[PDB]
Each structure stands twice: as C-alpha cells, then as structure tokens.
Nucleic acid binder design. Structure first.
Ligand SMILES: Nc1ccn([C@H]2C[C@H](O)[C@@H](COP(=O)(O)OP(=O)(O)CP(=O)(O)O)O2)c(=O)n1
Ligand SMILES: [Cl-]
Ligand SMILES: [Cl-]
Ligand SMILES: [Mg+2]
Ligand SMILES: [Mg+2]
Ligand code: NA
Ligand code: NA
Length: 326
DNA sequence: CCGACGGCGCATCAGC
DNA sequence: GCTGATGCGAC
DNA sequence: GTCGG
C-alpha cells in the first residue's frame, strides 16, 4: 500500500480490459505493471520514475502522472459511469460468469443480482452455485480458519488412505495472512507418470470430504482436478462459517515438485518464471521441466528432486514461497 | 516496426 | 458417440 | 500495453 492508489488504478484498468474489452494481453500488461510497482520500495513521485520499472511503459507512465496530480483517472471515471461496462464488470464477479456470458446476459436485460436470481433457469450449474454464494466467495479466509480447514482435509485424507499426501498451496503456502480460497495438492503413490494403478483416487477423497459435510457443492470435477465449495463446522449456538471455494489438484507423485511449484504460485510469479525459462531454453508446466530444441519442440523431462532444481535449470536464485507473491 | 506474451483441466457445444 | 474449438478459471 | 531484437 506504499503505492496503493496507483496499483488500485492499474488493477481496475486490468479488470476493464479483461471483462469488457476482452483484451487479455492488456489485462496481463496492467497486472504486470501493478505487480512491479507493488513491490517497488519507494513512494512513486512521477510517471517518469515508474517508467524505469520493467513493465511500465509510456501509456501507464502518463496515467500515473494524471493520477498523482488529480488523484484520479478520467478514463476510469467515465468507465464507472458507463452502464454497460458497470454491468459487465459486476456480472463477471459471479463465479462461472466470464466476460462472454456477462455481455450476453447484459444483451438479454439480465444486469443485476436480482436479475440473476429471477433467471436461475438461464444459468449453468457452476453459475448457479456462484450466484448462491456470491457474498461468501468475496470474503477472505483468515489464516486461522485456513489452519482449521487444513487440519480437517489432511486428517480426512489420512482416513481414506494413509499413503495420500495433501499439501495446501496457493497464497496459504506463500504465508498469506488471508486467502481467497483453499488450494490442495494431492498425491498418492499409486498415481505416477508411469501408471495409474488405482482408479477413483480423487473421487474417494472428494467423497470422504462430502461425507463429513466439509465439501458442500461441486463446480467441476474430473480425474485430476476438483473445483468446489466447502464449509467449516460451527459449534452449538454459533453462527455458521461462510462457504469457501476449494480447489484440489491430483498430481503424479513423481512430479510433486513441479506440481507444488505451479500450485504455490502466484500466477504472475508463474508467468514470470515460465517466460524466463523460455528465454533460457526450457519450458515448465505443473508436471515437468523440459528443454527446447532448436526446433522449439520440447525434449524429454529433466530430472527434478526439489523445487530448487527447477530454479537452478533456469539460472535463478531460489525463492522461498513467501517471496513469490508477485 | 512487430511478433510474442505460460500453460493446462473441466464444461459445453458445433460438426460429423 | 468422438474430436476439436471455446469459455472459464484470479486467467 | 510493453518489450526485445
Ligand atoms: N492464471 C493462473 C492462476 C493460478 N495459477 C496457479 C498459481 C496459484 O497460486 C495457484 C492457485 O490458484 P488461486 O486462484 O487459488 O490463486 P492464489 O495464489 O491462491 C490467490 P487466492 O488466495 O486464492 O485468492 O494456481 C496459475 O498458475 N495461473
Ligand atoms: Cl489484448
Ligand atoms: Cl509434461
Ligand atoms: Mg488460492
Ligand atoms: Mg484456487
Ligand atoms: Na519500464
Ligand atoms: Na466470474
């Protein structure tokens, strides 16, 4: 928050370009600029000063000058006034409504929360759950509740099969004092890059968490990724905890370190690291790190025995999770 | 210039 | 039914 | 919107 006013402005610009303009690269540019400015340890006094940071160019520098002089950006003031932009921006805050659906709903006269509730028949399953928990999903999760949630998931996972390992990643693993959701990496030795020796490995864990009423709703579910809703249990006479988003990713056990690197993030950190890998002649996904031939086609997976190995391949100093909140 | 911009799982739909 | 393109996802 | 070559 040293430069909170500027990073707020760029984040709002990013959301506009994403949600309304459907200009994903402009969205990514604004987020990169906000990220590099957020970690800049001086209170910025001019666009010129910010234009020294990689990712801040001529246009954003101009916007920082307008913002530092007036406290505001006319481009954003009129965006907030535009009814279509405001409606599209709002609707995309419902889980399952993306830019395209939001604009299509706006065309059909569906523009408000009350509009959405009247038109549940027009919503797919994901969207209906996002509407149902609209208020809950915008609340953050205190780290203390993340600790209680972790304890349930790991213990319940242990009850299904003592050989599962569940690791909470995302902002939690980066040490955040609050999280937007809970992200769980799951491994089991029967599932490796060589073979799947046991079916329903993710299903059995989802079922156990549903059985004890931790998982309450499913947004999407396949063999390796679960996206849904969970809730802490409350004591007698206690108000209920909000419902929370939970994501679970089942990763081949021999590919744990690439998987935990990916699932720890942040997303911008992953983008930065993967772009640098490319510049160094490697490609990184949640499973492997592979070299790029002269062709550009990926080669064979390189041996990985820690997170640090992946950093070493691309000639980066190791960064602890807490230092990856870009 | 101007081409690139990380990478992929699940849901839903068009076309066969 | 399958394959491939698209939306969505913090995207 | 920004960057590299
Ligand atoms: N566009 C994306 C989105 C996500 N990811 C990866 C990194 C996330 O940490 C990780 C979890 O994805 P996430 O959306 O849960 O992001 P968090 O860092 O946990 C921030 P939160 O506390 O949830 O509000 O998945 C990514 O690589 N690329
Ligand atoms: Cl774009
Ligand atoms: Cl791979
Ligand atoms: Mg998260
Ligand atoms: Mg998540
Ligand atoms: Na710059
Ligand atoms: Na949404």
């Amino acid at each position: 928050t040293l430069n909170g006013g500027i990073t707020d402005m760029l984040t709002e610009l990013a959301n506009f370009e994403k949600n309304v303009s459907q200009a994903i690269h402009k969205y990514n540019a604004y987020r990169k600029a906000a990220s590099v400015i957020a970690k800049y340890p001086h209170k910025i006094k001019s666009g010129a000063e910010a234009k020294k940071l990689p990712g801040v160019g001529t246009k954003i520098a101009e916007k920082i000058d307008e913002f530092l002089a007036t406290g505001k950006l006319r481009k954003l003031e009129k965006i907030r006034q535009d009814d279509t932009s405001s409606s599209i921006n709002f609707l995309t805050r419902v889980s399952g409504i993306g830019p395209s659906a939001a604009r299509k709903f706006v065309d059909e006269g569906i523009k408000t929360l009350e509009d959405l509730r009247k038109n549940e028949d027009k919503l797919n399953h994901h969207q209906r759950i996002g509407l149902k928990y609209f208020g809950d999903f915008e609340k953050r999760i205190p780290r203390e509740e993340m600790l209680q949630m972790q304890d349930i998931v790991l213990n319940e996972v242990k009850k299904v099969d003592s050989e599962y390992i569940a690791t909470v990643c995302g902002s939690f693993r980066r040490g955040a004092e609050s999280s937007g959701d809970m992200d769980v990496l799951l491994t089991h030795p029967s599932f490796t890059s060589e073979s799947t020796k046991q079916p329903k490995l993710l299903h059995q864990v989802v079922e156990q968490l549903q059985k004890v009423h931790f998982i309450t709703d499913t947004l999407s579910k396949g063999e390796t990724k679960f996206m849904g809703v969970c809730q802490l249990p409350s004591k007698n006479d206690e108000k209920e905890y909000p419902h929370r988003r939970i994501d679970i990713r089942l990763i081949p056990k021999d590919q744990y370190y690439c998987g935990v690197l990916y699932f720890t993030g942040s997303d911008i950190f992953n983008k930065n690291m993967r772009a640098h890998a490319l510049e160094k002649g490697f490609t990184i996904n949640e499973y492997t790190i592979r070299p790029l031939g002269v062709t550009g086609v990926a080669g064979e997976p390189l041996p990985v025995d820690s997170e640090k190995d992946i950093f070493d391949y691309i000639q980066w100093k190791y960064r602890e999770p807490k230092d990856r909140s870009e």
